[PDB]
Amino acid sequence: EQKNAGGVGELEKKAEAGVQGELAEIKKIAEKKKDDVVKILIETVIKPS
Amino acid sequence: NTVSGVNGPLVILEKVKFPRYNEIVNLTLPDGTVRQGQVLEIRGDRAIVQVFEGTSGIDVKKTTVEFTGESLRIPVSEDMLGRIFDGSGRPIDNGPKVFAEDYLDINGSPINPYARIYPEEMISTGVSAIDTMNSIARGQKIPIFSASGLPHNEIAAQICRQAGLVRPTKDVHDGHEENFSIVFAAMGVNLETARFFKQDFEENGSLERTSLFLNLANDPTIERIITPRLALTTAEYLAYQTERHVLTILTDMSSYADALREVSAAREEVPGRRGYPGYMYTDLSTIYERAGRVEGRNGSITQIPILTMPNDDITHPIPDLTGYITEGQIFVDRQLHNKGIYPPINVLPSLSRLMKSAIGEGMTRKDHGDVSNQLYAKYAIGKDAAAMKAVVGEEALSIEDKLSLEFLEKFEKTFITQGAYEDRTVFESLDQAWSLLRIYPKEMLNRISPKILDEFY
Amino acid sequence: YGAIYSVSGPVVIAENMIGCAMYELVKVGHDNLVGEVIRIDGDKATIQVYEETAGLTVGDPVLRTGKPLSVELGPGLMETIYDGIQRPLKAIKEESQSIYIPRGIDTPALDRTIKWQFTPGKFQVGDHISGGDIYGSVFENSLISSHKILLPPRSRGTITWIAPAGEYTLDEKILEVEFDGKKSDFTLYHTWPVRVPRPVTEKLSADYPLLTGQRVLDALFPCVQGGTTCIPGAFGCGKTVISQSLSKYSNSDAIIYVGCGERGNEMAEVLMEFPELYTEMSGTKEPIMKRTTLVANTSNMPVAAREASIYTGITLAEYFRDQGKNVSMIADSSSRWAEALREISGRLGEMPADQGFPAYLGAKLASFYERAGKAVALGSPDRTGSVSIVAAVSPAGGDFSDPVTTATLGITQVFWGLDKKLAQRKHFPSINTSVSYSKYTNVLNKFYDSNYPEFPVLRDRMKEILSNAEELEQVVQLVGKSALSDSDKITLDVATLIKEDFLQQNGYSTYDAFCPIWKTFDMMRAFISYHDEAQKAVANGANWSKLADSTGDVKHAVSSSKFFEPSRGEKEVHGEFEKLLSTMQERFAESTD
Amino acid sequence: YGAIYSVSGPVVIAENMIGCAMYELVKVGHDNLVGEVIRIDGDKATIQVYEETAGLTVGDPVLRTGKPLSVELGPGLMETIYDGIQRPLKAIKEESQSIYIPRGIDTPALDRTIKWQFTPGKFQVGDHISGGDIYGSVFENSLISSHKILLPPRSRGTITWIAPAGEYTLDEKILEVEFDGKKSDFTLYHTWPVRVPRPVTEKLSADYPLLTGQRVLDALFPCVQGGTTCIPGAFGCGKTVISQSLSKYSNSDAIIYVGCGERGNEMAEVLMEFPELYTEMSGTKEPIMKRTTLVANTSNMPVAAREASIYTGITLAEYFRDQGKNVSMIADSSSRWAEALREISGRLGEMPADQGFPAYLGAKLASFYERAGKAVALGSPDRTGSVSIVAAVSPAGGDFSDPVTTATLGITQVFWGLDKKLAQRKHFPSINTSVSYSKYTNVLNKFYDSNYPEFPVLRDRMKEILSNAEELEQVVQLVGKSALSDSDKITLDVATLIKEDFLQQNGYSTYDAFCPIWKTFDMMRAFISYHDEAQKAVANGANWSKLADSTGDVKHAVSSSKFFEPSRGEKEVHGEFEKLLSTMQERFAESTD
Amino acid sequence: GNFKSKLKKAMLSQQITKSTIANKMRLKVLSAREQSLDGIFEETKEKLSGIANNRDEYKPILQSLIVEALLKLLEPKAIVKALERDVDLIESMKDDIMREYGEKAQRAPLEEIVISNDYLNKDLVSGGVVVSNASDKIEINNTLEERLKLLSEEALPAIRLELYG
């Protein structure tokens, strides 16, 4: 039980560590093609959505 | 234009008739609120709308409307798994929304490509009393019908936790080769109970693979009736796109009936059979068309709907239509529950139509269906023999009744009694059947062929 | 055209309608959805648009076809699966990538792209023709020609052009008729409004057998070609099974399978099963499916399909009757049709009648059964054809007191009940003497008598033995068996053997699913004979117990006869049943002793 | 605002509503009777006016109150008898000289005689405050404070004016909060609409019991607080009696008493008995009455007040759940309550549904039980409360299978019966082991086991003994005593001692009405120890009569434990039970030998 | 025997933790995806203000927003609400709006454009119109912020799939 109230912290270290690679490719590929989606957003907005 | 008048949660709008059916309307009220609705009716410069939010707090000529230009279609993703939702598809954990990757109709089936190859390969749930006596297939719909005051929800929990601990041993035998996911719909289900279903999903390993939809009866009727359809669109999308068997646990069927009943009284409809809607068929049927194998025939939606009997009768319209549209039923009997049997699955009327059309070979015996026929027929005979024992007394009874009396007693405490975190294999149930069934001579065992019978009694 | 005034649920009102009838087919909107004008109130006509009205834009045009809802009669119906509005579902699979119709579907109401083989008949140029006359044939049955091509009813004349043999499409004209000038050219198919029956010269007195092939059903109350049958069903009653039996075993040249809004999983099953099955007539190329045409619809698949399903499926049976074919039309399940009238009255705003089901229910059902019968074919060669209706219904009140069962029963000539108590003991199809009759029985048993059986006498006795059994059983239950003769036990004992052995016949094989007239005779003959001999045996000395104990294995020998195939012995009578008579007589002497 | 268009019976129709919410509270005409706008068609509203319209004319104005039908819940709720629209009835008695209200006259919902002492919370000048955060507190009785003033839900901001400590009136403001401009002014009370339930951070699964201390209630089918419970009645054959018992033995932070629509002799009785009674926690100042706030409607008093009654109670109760108070909610009766709805439905001219009772019924019953339960209050402090709803029902139409009762058993997790014979014998609640169940038991036995008790093992055994006892008596009738022996005879005897000690109570003593968790644990420990050792002793050679006579002193002393003080071994711990274990061992030696 | 039930129970508490952590884990992956998606919309709307503040590039856009708005009205008289820097732009193209509207419907051109004395937020709202009927009870909020917000509903599935599928 002691490993179910103090060894469940390390299980949460391991959930933090596995997404710091994701939170960074998220920002990579969002930043590149950001500009290409805006152009589609503008022609669409000034016409019917 | 403005709200002309409002009747219960249907609102009479005066508005131009150009909008298409099911298009969202937004009423801008002077309270600051925006409330969303669906045109239930379009008429000549007027509409009848069901409001999503609310049922009241709606002004006459001070309230105004705006059109979306968009039909009611559910934004469905597969990023909605591993997260807890309300009955209208929004997190209650208040984090990022459902979002979409498609929009799918709930007003009519999208693709409708159901089964041209009969569901025929077995699904095991770890229960002898279910799986043997009623054969489950990938796309088949068998419902659990229970009575008021019973723990319908606890039996549904058993089904969830043991299904998916069977699957890797079943994977070897052939019955899965694909991801398994749960789509769980509550209408009219208690907070406590819901919290039990989440715990069930933790145990199994499919809290990450399930979507939970919670509507309470203290949330509008209009939200409540969307909740099963939202469940179905979610479940057929996983099933379609990445070829997954989704098992749908839809509790409770009468709670859904209840809401239909209130927007019938509020409609210009007359209620037919016993105060329930005269279009009660169309409602139920919308749910049941979606179930069966979907395109590519490695995706499916399998249904166990849960019904609690509102008056505790099997003459009441709800179970009677529902039973006709579905393939069989599983009965729970009150007398069992009180005695402390678990699961209290009384097999006296429990039968599933596909029994020799839900089995094959290489994972089931072909004898599997045949064995079921002995078990069901003897159970009944036994049940009759016990009825005569109660009246006449043993001395009066003949030899045939005594054997059968004995069979019945053994059946209750051994077959339908098993643990609640205890899995079973279909092979294993049949071997247990053979011993118990072995209490009669060959003259009397004649609901199975002499070849199979000679081997095993 | 028309202009859509309101779209309210699946009810649509459009104003500015002209030339509209009361069951006229219309296509609604720019989508062109299936609809039908139900009523007209002033200039505005209420049309129920029953294929998904979702996303229907209002102020679109509504187009009249100028005629009511129809079916297409002619080549390609066999080995092809349709819906109840008569659009081909099979066509939809290749293009849409969908089994059932969604919406936007505007495919023609028959496949007419394909070619079928035209053979001229016995008509030549300058020869006279009249409707229902056999102008040629197309081979599409298991063994015979299926789609025999007719001059459409209500035309006569002399044929100016007879095209010779060869392959042509549906579309291509190959016939010209002149009467009072050019009547029209004719093509391989014709159309016919479904809310009107196709004409006949005359209907004939049904008097010939319809084999069902279930032992129990044929025994107690056998069917005829041209009968009407009512069956209540509560799910799990083995409905599918008896339906499957009929399509194989019946002596009818055509089976039309009708899904009146079903599960879909159940429709797939029967479908898949038919090509594997082999015909008893030495079928080919998907043997049984070649004699099968499927109307298959799904539960919430368009309410136009469900309502129309029964009318379209009987119209197809009638075309076939006019060529002089025997058809068996199995409607499955018409309870759902009854539910469709419940809905049609409520959505429209009409008031219904007893128990929320309208009274228009009753007339509309009666018209449907009357289109059936045994018949002398339309057209001048004269042949006999049949449309024989066997229709399931169900409760709706969890009784047989509900308006649905009782109305359909009012009209019917054959009644085959439903027994929940017997169903538990594993009996299907479960019937009882007290819940079934056939007014055809008298004439039918005489017919069966000719073939070899002792059938008339045995049927009288079959009724009596089960009716006496029921009364006795009430006293045994309540009072006891110990206040009652050994003899009264005997009636129950013999009766039990009949209960398991007849009634359960759902089969786990073809051998346990098929029961010819000879085999049905044989099993009944051995049980009555046992009764007569047993009562003697005990009466001159012999206890009950000793008799029960002694016969023992013999009770079983008849029990197992169903599991064994009927192609065995001399013909269709087992050597096991032949021996069984000697064994019976040999047994009475020992029991008595 | 509006002009009356029409008056048809008790329904009033008023035109020229150009904005009016469909829950809006209204005063109609110049009589100024209570009404609420049920529906609206156009500018004509349907308003049900819940008092008589004798003297009301068409052509009189209807002035909107400017807010929906809501109730203010403040300090001073305690020691007051109210309607469901909330009018103080004691006040009416003062002025008019009657406990019933005069129509066309209303009075302020909360008393305005009362002034209460406000002391500041912890948010001071310019501090940010957020929903459910405690802005102050007010005394709600002299003895104790209980009404903590939180910031209203749906508000948040910075507090620009915080009044200093002192006594203020309900009328006068104390706080203004700024978010988007001055958002509005706040008072010591807050309003919350009656059909809108107050909010929480999240709800929990209750595992916490009631503080009733009713021994059979605790042990056999454990009381839950944060639960839903259905109790049979038939009126004054025990059901009102138990509600009065429940009030007495209980010592919850608040208790809210709801007479949904009772006989009015019963409402009078609740008011008078309570201030003479004593709280079982040993508090003072009209004891039970001080902790009870009473919404007491007889069925004669308007139908608005009957329907609003449950609503007003649940919203009030839920707020107390947000305050961090454990509430016992007693409703009497839901059968009456379903009837309030059916009445309204027929007047208006809408169709009611199943059994003549409305469509809206089921959703309304259901919402009500699910609203009650254990939660952590809204806001940063996160105090724990509970709302336990125990609703009484009787037969309605005289059948107890009708929709109302049957709908409610399905929702319930707790059932405790009532029987006329058991009620005569002074067993209250009148329960056995099959007229009662609890599915809350599982979590609850787990909760109690943690506290120190050996509870789960002992409780299961309690149920078993009662079940067995019943069963051995039937055998004595049919089979005889030949199937009876002394082992069985001890089983009957233990059940008798368990019935007398647990089931029978009526408050003969003060120690017969509060018995702690630890005391209840100790009674069941004596009786199970007697059982197992009596059986062992008769097996090594002893007789029932011999065991009975021999156990004697101990047997007498443990039956009488309810009359005996529960402060004997400390304050909750009873010394006699601890000394029983040793006596029992020496005793077992006397019984065997 | 009973060690196994309680061991199983604590072993169930062990995967109870395992799931709440693995759920929060994907809730972080998903809420980052949106933080960036709503910075694509952040770019869009800086563009929308910059164009709105043009008076020559903005006219063919503005006209099309009033014209489209009129097709989802279809009423004889319309009142058009705008920002006080777009009113002069409406004023110099009225004839063009009643024409373009009349051409795109069966209906004969709009009688009157009444340039409303109501004013939309200058802070929150940049360009576009609220087009309304004669009585002002039907409104199409056909502003640029609004149109972006409505496009987000359907634009979103397309973008989540190409970047993230």
PDB file of C-alpha atoms in Angstrom, chain B residues 275-436:
ATOM      1  CA  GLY B 275     -49.592   6.425 -22.267  1.00  0.00           C
ATOM      2  CA  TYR B 276     -46.333   5.974 -24.278  1.00  0.00           C
ATOM      3  CA  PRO B 277     -45.989   7.473 -27.883  1.00  0.00           C
ATOM      4  CA  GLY B 278     -47.864   5.865 -30.939  1.00  0.00           C
ATOM      5  CA  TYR B 279     -44.501   6.321 -32.786  1.00  0.00           C
ATOM      6  CA  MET B 280     -42.749   4.308 -29.963  1.00  0.00           C
ATOM      7  CA  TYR B 281     -41.542   1.878 -32.662  1.00  0.00           C
ATOM      8  CA  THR B 282     -39.738   4.457 -34.744  1.00  0.00           C
ATOM      9  CA  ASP B 283     -37.690   5.527 -31.663  1.00  0.00           C
ATOM     10  CA  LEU B 284     -36.544   2.167 -30.560  1.00  0.00           C
ATOM     11  CA  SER B 285     -35.819   1.044 -34.201  1.00  0.00           C
ATOM     12  CA  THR B 286     -33.426   3.928 -34.813  1.00  0.00           C
ATOM     13  CA  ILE B 287     -31.099   2.497 -32.139  1.00  0.00           C
ATOM     14  CA  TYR B 288     -31.457  -1.165 -33.311  1.00  0.00           C
ATOM     15  CA  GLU B 289     -30.755  -0.503 -37.121  1.00  0.00           C
ATOM     16  CA  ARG B 290     -27.293   0.499 -35.926  1.00  0.00           C
ATOM     17  CA  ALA B 291     -25.849  -2.789 -34.782  1.00  0.00           C
ATOM     18  CA  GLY B 292     -24.218  -5.385 -36.908  1.00  0.00           C
ATOM     19  CA  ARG B 293     -21.013  -5.583 -38.918  1.00  0.00           C
ATOM     20  CA  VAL B 294     -19.898  -2.304 -40.582  1.00  0.00           C
ATOM     21  CA  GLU B 295     -17.951  -2.121 -43.902  1.00  0.00           C
ATOM     22  CA  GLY B 296     -14.721  -4.097 -44.069  1.00  0.00           C
ATOM     23  CA  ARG B 297     -16.175  -6.723 -41.747  1.00  0.00           C
ATOM     24  CA  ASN B 298     -13.635  -6.453 -38.997  1.00  0.00           C
ATOM     25  CA  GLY B 299     -15.335  -3.482 -37.375  1.00  0.00           C
ATOM     26  CA  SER B 300     -18.636  -3.978 -35.641  1.00  0.00           C
ATOM     27  CA  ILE B 301     -21.018  -2.531 -33.062  1.00  0.00           C
ATOM     28  CA  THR B 302     -22.344  -5.105 -30.608  1.00  0.00           C
ATOM     29  CA  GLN B 303     -25.183  -4.070 -28.251  1.00  0.00           C
ATOM     30  CA  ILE B 304     -26.342  -5.060 -24.815  1.00  0.00           C
ATOM     31  CA  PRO B 305     -29.133  -2.779 -23.996  1.00  0.00           C
ATOM     32  CA  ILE B 306     -30.339  -2.570 -20.365  1.00  0.00           C
ATOM     33  CA  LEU B 307     -34.017  -2.412 -19.571  1.00  0.00           C
ATOM     34  CA  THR B 308     -35.629  -2.033 -16.160  1.00  0.00           C
ATOM     35  CA  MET B 309     -39.310  -2.998 -16.138  1.00  0.00           C
ATOM     36  CA  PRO B 310     -41.293  -0.043 -15.124  1.00  0.00           C
ATOM     37  CA  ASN B 311     -44.231  -2.027 -13.893  1.00  0.00           C
ATOM     38  CA  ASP B 312     -42.472  -5.295 -13.567  1.00  0.00           C
ATOM     39  CA  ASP B 313     -44.493  -6.904 -16.350  1.00  0.00           C
ATOM     40  CA  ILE B 314     -43.601  -8.561 -19.675  1.00  0.00           C
ATOM     41  CA  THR B 315     -46.903  -7.390 -21.194  1.00  0.00           C
ATOM     42  CA  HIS B 316     -46.071  -3.748 -20.751  1.00  0.00           C
ATOM     43  CA  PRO B 317     -45.277  -2.327 -24.281  1.00  0.00           C
ATOM     44  CA  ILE B 318     -41.692  -1.320 -23.588  1.00  0.00           C
ATOM     45  CA  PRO B 319     -40.145  -4.862 -23.204  1.00  0.00           C
ATOM     46  CA  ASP B 320     -42.560  -6.376 -25.806  1.00  0.00           C
ATOM     47  CA  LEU B 321     -41.506  -4.179 -28.869  1.00  0.00           C
ATOM     48  CA  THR B 322     -37.940  -4.022 -27.630  1.00  0.00           C
ATOM     49  CA  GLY B 323     -37.715  -7.875 -27.402  1.00  0.00           C
ATOM     50  CA  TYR B 324     -39.192  -8.226 -30.971  1.00  0.00           C
ATOM     51  CA  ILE B 325     -36.638  -5.802 -32.535  1.00  0.00           C
ATOM     52  CA  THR B 326     -33.694  -7.420 -30.660  1.00  0.00           C
ATOM     53  CA  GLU B 327     -32.355 -10.933 -30.832  1.00  0.00           C
ATOM     54  CA  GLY B 328     -33.391 -12.660 -27.619  1.00  0.00           C
ATOM     55  CA  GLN B 329     -33.357 -11.615 -24.036  1.00  0.00           C
ATOM     56  CA  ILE B 330     -31.519 -12.331 -20.831  1.00  0.00           C
ATOM     57  CA  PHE B 331     -33.926 -12.551 -17.760  1.00  0.00           C
ATOM     58  CA  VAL B 332     -33.199 -11.550 -14.193  1.00  0.00           C
ATOM     59  CA  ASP B 333     -35.479 -12.908 -11.563  1.00  0.00           C
ATOM     60  CA  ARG B 334     -36.084 -11.247  -8.214  1.00  0.00           C
ATOM     61  CA  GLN B 335     -36.459 -14.514  -6.251  1.00  0.00           C
ATOM     62  CA  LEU B 336     -32.803 -15.372  -7.170  1.00  0.00           C
ATOM     63  CA  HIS B 337     -31.415 -11.988  -6.275  1.00  0.00           C
ATOM     64  CA  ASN B 338     -32.854 -12.179  -2.689  1.00  0.00           C
ATOM     65  CA  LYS B 339     -31.447 -15.683  -2.109  1.00  0.00           C
ATOM     66  CA  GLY B 340     -27.979 -14.392  -2.827  1.00  0.00           C
ATOM     67  CA  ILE B 341     -27.178 -15.976  -6.081  1.00  0.00           C
ATOM     68  CA  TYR B 342     -24.742 -14.017  -8.400  1.00  0.00           C
ATOM     69  CA  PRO B 343     -25.315 -13.540 -11.256  1.00  0.00           C
ATOM     70  CA  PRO B 344     -29.192 -14.060 -10.724  1.00  0.00           C
ATOM     71  CA  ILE B 345     -29.626 -15.136 -14.376  1.00  0.00           C
ATOM     72  CA  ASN B 346     -32.857 -17.316 -14.346  1.00  0.00           C
ATOM     73  CA  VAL B 347     -32.777 -19.269 -17.554  1.00  0.00           C
ATOM     74  CA  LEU B 348     -36.544 -20.184 -17.733  1.00  0.00           C
ATOM     75  CA  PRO B 349     -37.343 -17.727 -20.582  1.00  0.00           C
ATOM     76  CA  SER B 350     -33.721 -16.621 -21.398  1.00  0.00           C
ATOM     77  CA  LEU B 351     -33.134 -17.675 -25.018  1.00  0.00           C
ATOM     78  CA  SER B 352     -31.167 -16.074 -27.866  1.00  0.00           C
ATOM     79  CA  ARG B 353     -32.417 -16.645 -31.419  1.00  0.00           C
ATOM     80  CA  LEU B 354     -28.901 -17.119 -32.890  1.00  0.00           C
ATOM     81  CA  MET B 355     -27.672 -20.195 -31.304  1.00  0.00           C
ATOM     82  CA  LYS B 356     -26.788 -22.270 -34.339  1.00  0.00           C
ATOM     83  CA  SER B 357     -26.001 -19.132 -36.303  1.00  0.00           C
ATOM     84  CA  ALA B 358     -23.778 -17.590 -33.680  1.00  0.00           C
ATOM     85  CA  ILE B 359     -21.394 -20.564 -33.482  1.00  0.00           C
ATOM     86  CA  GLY B 360     -19.072 -22.400 -35.877  1.00  0.00           C
ATOM     87  CA  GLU B 361     -15.995 -24.302 -34.991  1.00  0.00           C
ATOM     88  CA  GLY B 362     -12.463 -23.641 -33.856  1.00  0.00           C
ATOM     89  CA  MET B 363     -13.628 -21.664 -30.922  1.00  0.00           C
ATOM     90  CA  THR B 364     -16.928 -23.235 -30.182  1.00  0.00           C
ATOM     91  CA  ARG B 365     -18.198 -26.690 -30.494  1.00  0.00           C
ATOM     92  CA  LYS B 366     -20.941 -27.192 -32.974  1.00  0.00           C
ATOM     93  CA  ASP B 367     -22.352 -29.160 -30.044  1.00  0.00           C
ATOM     94  CA  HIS B 368     -22.313 -25.899 -28.120  1.00  0.00           C
ATOM     95  CA  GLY B 369     -25.847 -24.983 -29.363  1.00  0.00           C
ATOM     96  CA  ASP B 370     -27.001 -28.525 -28.896  1.00  0.00           C
ATOM     97  CA  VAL B 371     -25.950 -28.677 -25.292  1.00  0.00           C
ATOM     98  CA  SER B 372     -27.815 -25.365 -24.667  1.00  0.00           C
ATOM     99  CA  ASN B 373     -31.059 -27.130 -25.827  1.00  0.00           C
ATOM    100  CA  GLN B 374     -30.731 -29.904 -23.236  1.00  0.00           C
ATOM    101  CA  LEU B 375     -29.839 -27.327 -20.480  1.00  0.00           C
ATOM    102  CA  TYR B 376     -32.819 -25.073 -21.245  1.00  0.00           C
ATOM    103  CA  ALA B 377     -35.335 -27.885 -21.751  1.00  0.00           C
ATOM    104  CA  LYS B 378     -34.278 -29.683 -18.446  1.00  0.00           C
ATOM    105  CA  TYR B 379     -34.153 -26.495 -16.503  1.00  0.00           C
ATOM    106  CA  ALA B 380     -37.812 -25.946 -17.335  1.00  0.00           C
ATOM    107  CA  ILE B 381     -38.929 -29.484 -16.556  1.00  0.00           C
ATOM    108  CA  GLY B 382     -37.046 -29.218 -13.290  1.00  0.00           C
ATOM    109  CA  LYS B 383     -38.782 -25.971 -12.507  1.00  0.00           C
ATOM    110  CA  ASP B 384     -42.078 -27.614 -13.192  1.00  0.00           C
ATOM    111  CA  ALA B 385     -41.098 -30.611 -10.997  1.00  0.00           C
ATOM    112  CA  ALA B 386     -40.256 -28.253  -8.103  1.00  0.00           C
ATOM    113  CA  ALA B 387     -43.714 -26.579  -8.570  1.00  0.00           C
ATOM    114  CA  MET B 388     -45.301 -30.046  -8.135  1.00  0.00           C
ATOM    115  CA  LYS B 389     -43.084 -30.829  -5.164  1.00  0.00           C
ATOM    116  CA  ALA B 390     -44.271 -27.740  -3.362  1.00  0.00           C
ATOM    117  CA  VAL B 391     -47.928 -28.752  -3.905  1.00  0.00           C
ATOM    118  CA  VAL B 392     -48.188 -32.560  -3.875  1.00  0.00           C
ATOM    119  CA  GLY B 393     -45.095 -33.549  -1.812  1.00  0.00           C
ATOM    120  CA  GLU B 394     -42.313 -35.971  -2.709  1.00  0.00           C
ATOM    121  CA  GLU B 395     -44.117 -39.212  -1.856  1.00  0.00           C
ATOM    122  CA  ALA B 396     -46.821 -38.443  -4.525  1.00  0.00           C
ATOM    123  CA  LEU B 397     -44.241 -37.447  -7.221  1.00  0.00           C
ATOM    124  CA  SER B 398     -43.123 -40.011  -9.770  1.00  0.00           C
ATOM    125  CA  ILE B 399     -39.563 -41.102 -10.618  1.00  0.00           C
ATOM    126  CA  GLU B 400     -39.194 -38.654 -13.608  1.00  0.00           C
ATOM    127  CA  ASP B 401     -39.928 -35.594 -11.395  1.00  0.00           C
ATOM    128  CA  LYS B 402     -37.420 -36.646  -8.752  1.00  0.00           C
ATOM    129  CA  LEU B 403     -34.491 -36.641 -11.155  1.00  0.00           C
ATOM    130  CA  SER B 404     -35.529 -33.354 -12.560  1.00  0.00           C
ATOM    131  CA  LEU B 405     -35.994 -31.870  -9.022  1.00  0.00           C
ATOM    132  CA  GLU B 406     -32.441 -32.802  -8.388  1.00  0.00           C
ATOM    133  CA  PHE B 407     -31.144 -31.267 -11.679  1.00  0.00           C
ATOM    134  CA  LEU B 408     -32.757 -27.932 -10.792  1.00  0.00           C
ATOM    135  CA  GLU B 409     -30.991 -27.656  -7.401  1.00  0.00           C
ATOM    136  CA  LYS B 410     -27.549 -28.406  -8.855  1.00  0.00           C
ATOM    137  CA  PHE B 411     -28.207 -25.966 -11.607  1.00  0.00           C
ATOM    138  CA  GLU B 412     -28.782 -23.003  -9.295  1.00  0.00           C
ATOM    139  CA  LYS B 413     -25.776 -23.235  -6.981  1.00  0.00           C
ATOM    140  CA  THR B 414     -23.162 -24.291  -9.430  1.00  0.00           C
ATOM    141  CA  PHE B 415     -23.964 -23.090 -12.942  1.00  0.00           C
ATOM    142  CA  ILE B 416     -25.386 -19.680 -12.313  1.00  0.00           C
ATOM    143  CA  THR B 417     -23.297 -19.160  -9.269  1.00  0.00           C
ATOM    144  CA  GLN B 418     -19.817 -18.156 -10.177  1.00  0.00           C
ATOM    145  CA  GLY B 419     -17.573 -15.268  -8.950  1.00  0.00           C
ATOM    146  CA  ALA B 420     -17.712 -11.663  -9.961  1.00  0.00           C
ATOM    147  CA  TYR B 421     -14.076 -11.445 -10.962  1.00  0.00           C
ATOM    148  CA  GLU B 422     -14.036 -14.871 -12.343  1.00  0.00           C
ATOM    149  CA  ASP B 423     -13.691 -15.611 -16.055  1.00  0.00           C
ATOM    150  CA  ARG B 424     -14.985 -18.713 -17.908  1.00  0.00           C
ATOM    151  CA  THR B 425     -14.283 -20.249 -21.289  1.00  0.00           C
ATOM    152  CA  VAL B 426     -16.989 -21.672 -23.507  1.00  0.00           C
ATOM    153  CA  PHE B 427     -15.315 -25.162 -23.477  1.00  0.00           C
ATOM    154  CA  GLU B 428     -15.237 -25.074 -19.732  1.00  0.00           C
ATOM    155  CA  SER B 429     -18.946 -24.222 -19.422  1.00  0.00           C
ATOM    156  CA  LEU B 430     -19.958 -27.154 -21.636  1.00  0.00           C
ATOM    157  CA  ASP B 431     -17.813 -29.611 -19.639  1.00  0.00           C
ATOM    158  CA  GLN B 432     -19.648 -28.295 -16.458  1.00  0.00           C
ATOM    159  CA  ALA B 433     -22.942 -28.784 -18.228  1.00  0.00           C
ATOM    160  CA  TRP B 434     -22.248 -32.429 -19.183  1.00  0.00           C
ATOM    161  CA  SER B 435     -21.754 -33.411 -15.436  1.00  0.00           C
ATOM    162  CA  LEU B 436     -24.797 -31.652 -14.255  1.00  0.00           C
TER     163      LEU B 436
END
